[PDB]
């Protein structure tokens, strides 16, 4: 389904990649995206899919564009254009310096000191979930751990009832991996309609939860408006309900196939933070982008005002120019180069929370369930979009080889 090639785009730069359904998806989603890094593909290409847009395919270009907000604006950061135009989340839809005071507030509610404060609850929940699954000798990891672990931590931090999880999970899915069942705008509005009365309640009677803190925060010497609070809280919900969930599944899928990697971490758990970084590189999963603020020649390519450019965070660390043998998982790489949490002013506000959840998962799962595998004859399917993911991950193990703590 191909949009007519714009007059300014030369034909040798055309490469019709579909970010929502890449042709090589059966090989794994990262593998499917890595077709953009084969020798037949220029550094910067135009796809006619999804309305037509640029794709930067090398880490150097991706990093440069994320730094240059003057030319590459976050005002319209999603493909297709309809989604990007409807996108108004805070701080992501803002460029510097406007994003700054909102980002500071975001750091207050999902940043480091908050992680350090909730760390006991994070540890508690991982141990509880895993111990409950342990005697079963099987699970569907996506529904049984990857979802409830980070999502329940988020709902705890946000002071939201766990019964709202299915609905919010559906809406966030529609924004990052659309079904066709609803436009981005309709999904976004449903999320907003959920938040609107909660924000008003918590402006009236403030709590100490993330929503209360955002809704009662200060911007530019004045109170945050109910609208601004809604737009930021909406982003926090999307940010809290999708990426870590899907990332955990890619990592656990890998570990299920790699006993030697499991033992490295069990025997020398001080290597776990580096392993976290390497898995974040290899199983990177986000791809959003920017819109051109003006005509601009970038690496020899003429970009036009209003052109969209996908700058896949996923691709920087898979670029062989950034990491040798990029598809190999090597916990001992001297430098794990990646932009998995993004780059520039919008570098993920939740990255500390994400890392903690990952490192807790690695340690606590491998302690109790050191030996496990993918269920016999199970076909693991990945999905692709703004955030890529694992559809289902059936795991099996012999309970006799497990340990309670
Ligand atoms: C492995 C897990 C995660 C990954 C890979 C990831 C990735 C990213 C990326 C690539 C961006 C930048 C998007 C852009 O530049 O347009 C971003 C932004 C953001 N993320 Fe995450 N993230 C993760 C976990 C989390 C968590 C747990 C939260 C908690 C709510 C969170 C909240 C946010 C927020 C609020 C922003 C916006 C920052 C800004 O625009 O200034 N993220 N994330
Ligand atoms: C691209 C993102 C990962 C980043 C945080 C959530 C997300 C889906 C956004 O809308 C901005
Ligand atoms: C961020 N998600
Ligand atoms: K390329
Ligand atoms: K917009």
UniProtKB/Swiss-Prot annotation:
Q: Which organism is it from?
A: Pseudomonas putida (Arthrobacter siderocapsulatus)
- The protein depicted here goes by the name Camphor 5-monooxygenase
Alphabetized Gene3D superfamilies for the sequence: Cytochrome P450
Q: What is its main location?
A: cytoplasm
Q: What's a Pfam family this protein contains?
A: p450
Instruction: Provide the top EC class.
Output: oxidoreductase
Q: Which SUPFAM superfamilies has this protein been placed in?
A: Cytochrome P450
CDD domains for the chain: P450cam-like
Instruction: Name the needed cofactors.
Output: heme
Task: Quote the record's binding site residues for heme.
Answer: 348
According to UniProt, this protein's pathway is: Terpene metabolism; (R)-camphor degradation
Q: According to the UniProt entry, what is the EC number of this protein?
A: 1.14.15.1
Naming one, the record's GO cellular component terms include: cytoplasm
